[PDB]
Design a protein around this ligand. Structure first.
Ligand SMILES: CCCCCCCCCCCCCCCCCCCCCC
Ligand SMILES: *C/C=C(C)/C=C\C=C(C)\C=C\C1=C(C)CCCC1(C)C
Ligand SMILES: CCCCCCCCO[C@@H]1O[C@H](CO)[C@@H](O)[C@H](O)[C@H]1O
Ligand SMILES: CCCCCCCCCCCCCCCC(=O)O
Ligand SMILES: *C(=O)CCCCCCCCCCCCCCC
Length: 350
């Protein structure tokens, strides 16, 4: 009788008025997300493997990186193959409502986790680079551990609403993947959406900007300070300190690129969602929602590749364990120099 009917999940009327997209579109969608599964799990596994097992990458802050990779790993796993990919190739979600909920809930829980983890990373950056060199503070296992616990609690908190009725996780677009309900406009649903956007999204964003804008409005605070201590009879041993700042600065830069990646990846879909909940629902067509959600879903497969082209210690490790990966991005000793000096201690004024 219809092309959208699902015996397990009640498709919102809105998605029911559209014609069924062509086979080639379903197939491309499945192939697409399936490849995010491979790259995502592949790349994130490597970071988790390399970071937990390399000695040069054993600092507390790096735990955030690992946490982020676990987050992105699980997103790519659960959101790609086989729940969506298989659904596409059959032009239908055959895994039942429970799976849909788990799917949507997992997607949200780790989407909220990736930015909040980045937030914790932006904080570490502020303590090592944002504050003055005299008050510079490095991340400690204690702190770090407590921070991720906050991250996990936070992430689950703002994504579990629909699990208990305060919102919902159902099919969207071509009906082969799940997400929260941004169509229904009842008090309940709308409050959960507002909570997701404000608490889950805008929240960590503020922390981010407050930390990076704080690192920018301190580049000069540091610019002067560097000199004051420089001519402070500080010998050639001043170079050491300088290298350290460069090394840290580079990582801070990295942090920003992965954050930019996240935002550029999710903001579109976020917007289309808001239109569906506050604007012209007639705009939210099958592709209007689908295409932007795919872009969002792939977000979880970018950090590893970003790291592989700009992270020295990490690039080192790769060259030493899975060198084929760095083919087009060949590693060199000179990439780790700044880390060498930054750590090479001075023997009693040398
Ligand atoms: C049904 C036909 C299937 C053909 C499959 C051909 C696939 C061979 C793929 C080789 C892929 C290795 C991928 C795992 C590595 C993840 C890539 C991410 C790069 C991360 C860098 C940090
Ligand atoms: C493909 C499956 C998905 C997108 C499942 C669930 C997604 C959410 C609960 C997303 C929430 C949001 C995030 C992570 C960041 C941008 C804004 C947002 C509220 C749409
Ligand atoms: C991109 C994510 C940035 C994570 C920053 C990890 C912070 C680890 O920064 C590390 O601090 C060590 C001193 O404790 C230095 O020896 C390392 O070179 C430096 O990379
Ligand atoms: C559906 C559940 C998904 C969760 C599976 C996560 C698996 C990620 C890989 C974890 C690697 C951790 C290795 C620790 C090192 C020790 O040894
Ligand atoms: C060096 O660090 C590069 C590592 C190689 C990572 C593999 C990247 C393959 C992903 C292909 C992306 C295709 C999308 C098309 C974009 C224009």
């Amino acid at each position: 009788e219809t092309w959208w009917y699902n015996p397990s999940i009640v498709v919102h009327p809105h998605w029911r008025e559209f014609d069924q997209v062509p086979d080639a579109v379903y197939y491309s969608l499945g192939i697409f997300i399936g490849i995010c599964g491979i790259i995502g799990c592949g790349g994130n596994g490597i970071v988790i493997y390399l970071f937990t097992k390399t000695k040069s990458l054993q600092t507390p802050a790096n735990m955030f990186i690992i946490n982020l990779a676990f987050s992105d790993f699980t997103f790519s796993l659960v959101n790609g193959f086989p729940l969506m990919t298989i659904s596409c190739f059959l032009k239908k979600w055959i895994f039942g409502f429970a799976a849909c909920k788990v799917y949507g809930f997992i997607g949200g829980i780790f989407g909220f986790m990736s930015i909040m983890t980045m937030a914790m990373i932006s904080i570490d950056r502020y303590n090592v680079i944002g504050r003055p060199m005299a008050a510079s503070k490095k991340m400690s296992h204690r702190r770090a551990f407590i921070m991720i616990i906050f991250v996990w609690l936070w992430s689950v908190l703002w994504a579990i609403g629909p699990i208990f009725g305060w919102g919902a996780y159902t099919l969207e677009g071509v009906l082969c993947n799940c997400s929260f309900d941004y169509i229904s406009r009842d008090s309940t649903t709308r409050s959960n959406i507002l909570c997701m956007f404000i608490l889950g999204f805008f929240g960590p964003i503020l922390i981010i900007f407050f930390c990076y804008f704080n690192i920018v409005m301190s580049v000069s605070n540091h610019e002067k300070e560097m000199a004051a201590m420089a001519k402070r009879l500080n010998a050639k041993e001043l170079r050491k300190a300088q290298a350290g700042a460069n090394a840290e600065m580079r990582l801070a830069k990295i942090s920003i690129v992965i954050v930019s990646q996240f935002l550029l990846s999710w903001s579109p879909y976020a917007v289309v969602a808001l239109l569906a909940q506050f604007g012209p629902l007639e705009w939210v067509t099958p592709y209007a929602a689908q295409l932007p959600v795919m872009f969002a879903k792939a977000s979880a497969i970018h950090n590893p590749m970003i790291y592989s082209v700009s992270h020295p210690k990490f690039r080192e490790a790769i060259s030493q364990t899975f060198p084929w990966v760095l083919t087009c991005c060949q590693f060199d000793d000179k990439e780790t120099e700044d880390d060498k000096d930054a750590e090479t201690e001075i023997p009693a004024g040398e």
